Amino acid sequence: GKTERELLAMVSSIQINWSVTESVFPPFSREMFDRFRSSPPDSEYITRIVSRCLINSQEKLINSSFFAEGNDKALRFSKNAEECSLAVERALNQYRAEDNLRDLNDHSSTIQLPPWLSYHDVDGKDLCPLQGLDVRGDHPMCNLWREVVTSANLEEIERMHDDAAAELEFALSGVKDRPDERNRYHRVHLNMGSDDSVYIAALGVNGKKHKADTLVQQMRDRSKQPFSPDHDVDHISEFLSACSSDLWATDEDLYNPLSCDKELRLAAQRIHQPSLSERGFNEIITEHYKFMGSRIGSWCQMVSLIGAELSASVKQHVKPNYFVIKRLLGSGIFLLIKPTSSKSHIFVSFAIKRSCWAFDLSTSRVFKPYIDAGDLLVTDFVSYKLSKLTNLCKCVSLMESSFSFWAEAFGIPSWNFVGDLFRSSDSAAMDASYMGKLSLLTLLEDKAATEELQTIARYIIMEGFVSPPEIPKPHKMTSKFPKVLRSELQVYLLNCLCRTIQRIAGEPFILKKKDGSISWGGMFNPFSGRPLLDMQPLISCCYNGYFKNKEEETEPSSLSGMYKKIIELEHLRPQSDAFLGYKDPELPRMHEFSVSYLKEACNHAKLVLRSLYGQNFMEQIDNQIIRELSGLTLERLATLKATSNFNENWYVYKDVADKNYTRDKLLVKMSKYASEGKSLAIQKFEDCMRQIESQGCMHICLFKKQQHGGLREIYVMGAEERIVQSVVETIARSIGKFFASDTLCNPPNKVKIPETHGIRARKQCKGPVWTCATSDDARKWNQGHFVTKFALMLCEFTSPKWWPLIIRGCSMFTRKRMMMNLNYLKILDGHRELDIRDDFVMDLFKAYHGEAEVPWAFKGKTYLETTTGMMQGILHYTSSLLHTIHQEYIRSLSFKIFNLKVAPEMSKGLVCDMMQGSDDSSMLISFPADDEKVLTRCKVAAAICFRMKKELGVYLAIYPSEKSTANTDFVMEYNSEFYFHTQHVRPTIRWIAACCSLPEVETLVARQEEASNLMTSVTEGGGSFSLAAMIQQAQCTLHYMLMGMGVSELFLEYKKAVLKWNDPGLGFFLLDNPYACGLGGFRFNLFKAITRTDLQKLYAFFMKKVKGSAARDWADEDVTIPETCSVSPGGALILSSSLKWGSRKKFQKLRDRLNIPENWIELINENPEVLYRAPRTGPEILLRIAEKVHSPGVVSSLSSGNAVCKVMASAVYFLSATIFEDTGRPEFNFLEDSKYSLLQKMAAYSGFHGFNDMEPEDILFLFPNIEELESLDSIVYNKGEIDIIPRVNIRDATQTRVTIFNEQKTLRTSPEKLVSDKWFGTQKSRIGKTTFLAEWEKLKKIVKWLEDTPEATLAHTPLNNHIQVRNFFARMYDALMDLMIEDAKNNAFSHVVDCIELDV
């Protein structure tokens, strides 16, 4: 009320002065708003356009599918094959005709590492003098790098190296006794020291014949010249197809370097499965058998260890004439490494003792060829970027998880899979081995275009599901092929997709309702001709998996691709605003839209909103916005999202030169704005919009994320613009949330609608029903949408008070100004005129310093300016509203076309529920199939789905893409969640690729918590607990490789100490039980750890009430080892080390900039007059953002990080860390048994943990009862349906926040049974014990009160959690209104579709 009255007074404060908007933002003008709010739609135009659109859709359907009259189905499909063939060879002879191309005999090999497999050598990482002397017989003969490794060998015979011998006894002394020694000048560290003892920092004598820079320069000039599609890849397909039994064998070739921690896994299962006294692991047998599969597991170990050693060697700094020499732990393989160029480039040569190498190559010719020198094989130098070194670091875990996934996908059990892959008679084994080797080739060759080809396979495969009224046109995807092919794998993938297009064009996938359930035959793997039978592997063949990282990209081709897109359509501006909201287009150009039909869509959507929510709906849509604008606080905008400092400066590079650009956080501007009494975003929107008018544009900076396939191309807008965006967003989102069919506003409608469609169809009409497709692609959604339509759309909905806010926000969205990365312009100033991407780079080069006038690039300016389109992430909900408007019109037009076409009594039917996200459209039309008129209804549905995208979309600048699919009965797709007939699939491989995230949290309990969160993420989307268990074994080898289990001999001493004390803060990876690995989180393992293992006795000794908080640690020294550490639990599971590489200087500078209050008591004493659920005022908002800042995890240096540096510290420091001081005296005179009140304090929801673990406590090896029919039943169940005695929230803040239960008498008594604190007394500090949990009562609120609920989809119906954990384990309004009138002039078109469909 009072806040509501103040917000409405602020709204009355806002005003629109038109002369300023017409001045600075030209296509915004008072006349256009007045005509649109005033002029009703002229119906003659709207009839003219829907009639012409109907004709177009008919003619396009005819000449697409029915190429003439009197055509047999075989003739139609043969002409389709002719068309697709000609389109294909047009695509190929795009590539054949090129300026340059490699000769077909010349080869490339994709995996640059050698195929070697080495029998186990003498232990230790030192390059010993015997490993120098024994390999002397090199026989150089002036071959490539034989003379260099001979020089290194001859030096190795002498002692002319920094470490010819490394001793572990010195490092044990350094761990147990802190003052180990002085620091060697050769030992170059990055974080927390480096020991001349822990890593071989030996430097070998320089080669006089060759310097690697010119060798890579000539090889790079060759890499510039492209690859033809007629290049032979017969060796590639030979490798992936034929080699099956070679890959699997157990001869202990190199399994040891990562097979070290087996006993630790035997400990971890002993916590969870008490009754395995046989040492009888169940998933660990497959884990170590797969790792023991020598032909791939040993080779993946070699990849992982060279990746880890190189990541350690990036931080190593070497004087330029010399190069470092290293050796892997307990291996014959030597790495000769040069970080000569610090520009993310490391140069590596490998050398294996010929005595060490044996029993194979892994395979020939799909690997870098190796030179023989008799004594030792060797290889030529190869270059690597640091972004690729993280991928090489994680090769065993990624390949284990990908092979286990593909074994599960083709029905092989994920624990017996290496045995089945050894003896591969069934085609499921051959296809699993094919796809696993394909994933291996993708991983070792990191390239965006290779994943792009894998992604295009999705649209090619989906085109085969189109219904007989339609015909497949998979050759439509030939437009979206890569411009240039840059490796043999792209050639193989392109040839695969070309033959795939040929097969799909030949005939479609043929559906059959045999058992009252549709199923598709003729399906096949997109990358090999092996037939499939399951939808899930077909979907999972596409969606190539990607790693996520938040980092900039400095490769100029990547930023040129970023900047290309908006600038492609910037030139397509029609320079005439007659169409842009002033007048109706007849044949709409690019960026145009029709005023009258936008108003008709608005009026129709008002009519459906009226008929759903009643007569006063606008009043309802009024108040919802007020609630949203009472919810929109500055704290909501106070997040970790970055913010641009490009305002009013950095415009000319000469003034902008010599100063880096830095993206300030949102918190500095939010706290500067909240330093005044500016309690809400709207109260500051008033000032911000005037500021934005003063500058006369929007300031935006461009930020291309480094990863690929994730959220790339981020547009970091400014603070005032963020404020304006947020108020416009809350308006847009309010009116959009009144829409049922929208999905971005209400995702439960998205999960509900595809499930509910079957019930609505069967309830309305009796019998089977067909469907149509989802045109989820939208052609250039962001670039092409002018914003005047957004303004007119939103102004049609809101009350008259809001229109100035809408008009001014859309007005700043018209004209917009975005900055490039300054290193890009530093490149372009001194660039050559040989820029290949002349569409942008030559154009920008002339625009910046040149003759060419360009309407986006300005003279000597550091910005791209665009008077059209929109950003990607700016105005999501407004565009979702536009798309919802369009689709709501199309629904009634669909009923109109169905009534005009088939019968007047078809409104009883045609259930046509929609699904429209930001740019993802979807539609499905159910109609009965009783009579033989259903084929006519299918023709009508084809015309309807045609007109939805291809025809009335253009009038709303809504452009359908070729990537759309049309008329795919019993098939639908939306947001990569495919819905086949009574079966729901999603591509799970995208999360299996991510579960080996290798997280840099640097807390050692948060690390395992993050691993558990990712594994639960795989369990949420598809997957199985056996697959999750194998992925967790991959995670555990990854984590124990963050410790030096293949990187330091001290890990061998970490083992025994680790067995003495099993706690996750010590670094002991707690394995979840395999029968339910995904439901139980890290809390489940911690509860079982304290309940079973003696680690609770350490918690019995070290505890806050008996011992103390983070200041008081059981180790009297704070920093235990020279490598960093702490004992701070922070109201959570206790970490026994920190290892915080973050300097924390940047967080200190952040805290200085936020000007937050310093004392921090004011939350604690004034906690009862802050509702932490909701702040109210600038002081309270300031302390809430300060609480958000000082939380763990969200610390700037906790967020800030890097992968190579983190992995280098992970064994340089971590092997020494935690060892022989914390572990030497962890608990003496320790209380054997833990208190029970303290036990429930550690885990408040111990009751749920006991209920969930009661079933999977004791369990056998495996209990498979094979089912006959396997298929999802469209069923979902939640384990969190089980609730605590208090159904109400656990917060009860001031006993006023929630009113879900009345008068709370017993509801109050149950909580203090568990809490053991006075919930009464206003929840004050002294509620029986001041600081009973911790000092911060906000921290007490966080830790004491917390609830949650999980969710999972099932194979068979649920009744309770036990059959959940059993089954989820792998078993293997009125249509008559808005009466628009259409033209039925060409009924001969309908006649020919009907007759030829009858004759087929």
Short mmCIF file of C-alpha atoms in Angstrom, two decimals, residues 986-1146:
data_model
loop_
_atom_site.label_atom_id
_atom_site.label_comp_id
_atom_site.label_asym_id
_atom_site.label_seq_id
_atom_site.Cartn_x
_atom_site.Cartn_y
_atom_site.Cartn_z
CA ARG A 986 16.61 -35.72 -24.55
CA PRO A 987 20.24 -35.83 -25.64
CA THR A 988 21.98 -36.95 -22.49
CA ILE A 989 25.48 -36.83 -23.99
CA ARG A 990 25.64 -33.07 -23.49
CA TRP A 991 25.79 -33.55 -19.71
CA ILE A 992 28.05 -36.64 -19.76
CA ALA A 993 30.52 -34.40 -21.60
CA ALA A 994 30.30 -31.87 -18.76
CA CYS A 995 30.45 -34.13 -15.70
CA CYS A 996 34.26 -34.09 -15.81
CA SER A 997 34.25 -30.34 -15.22
CA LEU A 998 37.55 -30.31 -13.25
CA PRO A 999 36.30 -27.51 -10.97
CA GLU A 1000 38.58 -24.81 -9.52
CA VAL A 1001 36.69 -24.01 -6.32
CA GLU A 1002 39.78 -24.55 -4.10
CA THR A 1003 37.97 -25.57 -0.92
CA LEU A 1004 38.22 -29.43 -1.09
CA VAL A 1005 34.65 -29.91 0.08
CA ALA A 1006 33.13 -27.61 -2.52
CA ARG A 1007 35.19 -29.51 -5.11
CA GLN A 1008 33.47 -32.80 -4.28
CA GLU A 1009 30.15 -30.96 -3.88
CA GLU A 1010 30.53 -29.58 -7.41
CA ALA A 1011 31.36 -33.05 -8.73
CA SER A 1012 28.25 -34.42 -7.01
CA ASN A 1013 26.16 -31.57 -8.42
CA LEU A 1014 27.30 -32.37 -11.96
CA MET A 1015 26.68 -36.10 -11.51
CA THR A 1016 23.21 -35.29 -10.22
CA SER A 1017 22.79 -33.09 -13.30
CA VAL A 1018 23.39 -36.12 -15.52
CA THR A 1019 20.99 -38.10 -13.32
CA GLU A 1020 18.34 -35.40 -13.77
CA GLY A 1021 18.46 -35.45 -17.57
CA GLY A 1022 18.11 -39.02 -18.77
CA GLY A 1023 20.95 -41.28 -17.78
CA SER A 1024 21.03 -44.14 -15.32
CA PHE A 1025 22.59 -44.73 -11.94
CA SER A 1026 24.93 -47.33 -13.42
CA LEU A 1027 25.96 -44.75 -16.03
CA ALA A 1028 26.17 -42.17 -13.25
CA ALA A 1029 28.33 -44.58 -11.24
CA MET A 1030 30.79 -45.06 -14.10
CA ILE A 1031 30.82 -41.29 -14.62
CA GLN A 1032 31.56 -40.96 -10.91
CA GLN A 1033 34.50 -43.35 -11.25
CA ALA A 1034 35.71 -41.06 -14.03
CA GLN A 1035 35.25 -38.11 -11.68
CA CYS A 1036 37.16 -39.87 -8.91
CA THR A 1037 40.16 -40.62 -11.11
CA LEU A 1038 39.98 -36.98 -12.26
CA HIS A 1039 39.96 -35.71 -8.68
CA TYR A 1040 42.71 -38.00 -7.44
CA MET A 1041 44.65 -36.83 -10.51
CA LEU A 1042 44.24 -33.25 -9.28
CA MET A 1043 46.38 -34.68 -6.52
CA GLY A 1044 49.51 -36.21 -7.91
CA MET A 1045 48.34 -39.82 -8.28
CA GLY A 1046 49.95 -39.74 -11.72
CA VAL A 1047 51.88 -36.54 -10.99
CA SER A 1048 53.75 -37.10 -7.68
CA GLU A 1049 55.34 -39.92 -5.72
CA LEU A 1050 54.09 -38.18 -2.59
CA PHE A 1051 50.60 -39.36 -3.49
CA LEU A 1052 51.85 -42.86 -2.66
CA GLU A 1053 52.38 -41.55 0.88
CA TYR A 1054 49.07 -39.70 0.69
CA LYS A 1055 47.42 -43.11 0.28
CA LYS A 1056 48.24 -44.68 3.66
CA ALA A 1057 47.60 -41.48 5.62
CA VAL A 1058 44.35 -41.12 3.68
CA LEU A 1059 43.37 -44.63 4.76
CA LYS A 1060 44.00 -43.67 8.38
CA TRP A 1061 41.55 -40.75 8.17
CA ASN A 1062 38.75 -40.84 5.58
CA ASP A 1063 37.24 -37.36 5.45
CA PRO A 1064 36.45 -35.33 2.33
CA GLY A 1065 38.21 -32.22 3.65
CA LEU A 1066 41.41 -34.30 3.72
CA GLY A 1067 40.87 -34.93 0.01
CA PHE A 1068 39.25 -38.39 0.20
CA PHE A 1069 36.75 -38.75 -2.64
CA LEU A 1070 33.61 -40.23 -1.08
CA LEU A 1071 32.03 -42.73 -3.48
CA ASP A 1072 28.23 -42.88 -3.49
CA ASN A 1073 26.75 -46.38 -3.57
CA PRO A 1074 26.08 -47.60 -7.12
CA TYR A 1075 22.44 -48.68 -6.72
CA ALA A 1076 21.45 -45.07 -5.97
CA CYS A 1077 24.38 -42.87 -6.96
CA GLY A 1078 22.42 -39.89 -8.26
CA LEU A 1079 19.68 -39.31 -5.68
CA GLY A 1080 22.09 -39.08 -2.76
CA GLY A 1081 24.19 -35.93 -2.82
CA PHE A 1082 27.41 -35.01 -1.09
CA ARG A 1083 25.38 -34.75 2.13
CA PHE A 1084 24.45 -38.43 1.81
CA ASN A 1085 28.10 -39.45 1.63
CA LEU A 1086 29.03 -37.14 4.51
CA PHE A 1087 26.26 -38.63 6.67
CA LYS A 1088 27.38 -42.17 5.89
CA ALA A 1089 31.02 -41.16 6.45
CA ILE A 1090 30.33 -39.88 9.95
CA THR A 1091 27.97 -42.76 10.72
CA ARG A 1092 30.31 -45.58 9.60
CA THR A 1093 33.88 -44.27 9.51
CA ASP A 1094 35.90 -42.94 12.44
CA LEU A 1095 36.00 -39.49 10.76
CA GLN A 1096 33.09 -38.53 13.03
CA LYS A 1097 35.48 -39.12 15.90
CA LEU A 1098 37.63 -36.41 14.38
CA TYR A 1099 34.46 -34.34 14.31
CA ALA A 1100 33.93 -35.52 17.88
CA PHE A 1101 37.35 -34.09 18.71
CA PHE A 1102 37.35 -31.12 16.32
CA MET A 1103 33.95 -29.47 16.62
CA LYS A 1104 32.83 -25.91 17.05
CA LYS A 1105 31.45 -26.26 20.57
CA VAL A 1106 34.30 -28.42 21.90
CA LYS A 1107 37.23 -27.03 19.84
CA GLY A 1108 36.21 -23.82 18.04
CA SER A 1109 35.45 -21.93 14.82
CA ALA A 1110 37.80 -21.26 11.87
CA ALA A 1111 40.13 -19.14 14.01
CA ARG A 1112 40.64 -22.09 16.38
CA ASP A 1113 41.98 -25.07 14.42
CA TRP A 1114 43.21 -28.40 15.74
CA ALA A 1115 46.53 -27.68 14.07
CA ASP A 1116 47.90 -24.87 16.24
CA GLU A 1117 49.64 -23.39 13.21
CA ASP A 1118 47.08 -21.86 10.85
CA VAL A 1119 48.88 -22.57 7.55
CA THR A 1120 49.86 -26.19 8.19
CA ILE A 1121 52.12 -26.92 5.19
CA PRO A 1122 53.98 -24.19 3.25
CA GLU A 1123 51.32 -24.97 0.68
CA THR A 1124 48.25 -23.14 1.92
CA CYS A 1125 45.56 -24.64 4.16
CA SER A 1126 42.89 -23.85 6.73
CA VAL A 1127 40.32 -25.51 9.01
CA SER A 1128 37.38 -23.18 8.31
CA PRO A 1129 34.03 -25.02 7.91
CA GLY A 1130 32.07 -21.78 7.56
CA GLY A 1131 28.89 -23.39 8.85
CA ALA A 1132 29.34 -26.40 6.55
CA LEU A 1133 31.47 -29.50 6.12
CA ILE A 1134 34.98 -28.75 7.38
CA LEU A 1135 37.80 -28.21 4.87
CA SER A 1136 41.23 -29.42 6.00
CA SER A 1137 42.90 -27.30 3.29
CA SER A 1138 42.10 -24.26 1.14
CA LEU A 1139 44.89 -24.05 -1.47
CA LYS A 1140 43.46 -20.68 -2.47
CA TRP A 1141 45.49 -19.62 -5.50
CA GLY A 1142 43.30 -16.54 -5.64
CA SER A 1143 45.40 -13.69 -4.34
CA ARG A 1144 42.25 -12.12 -2.80
CA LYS A 1145 43.61 -8.68 -3.73
CA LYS A 1146 40.84 -8.28 -6.28
#
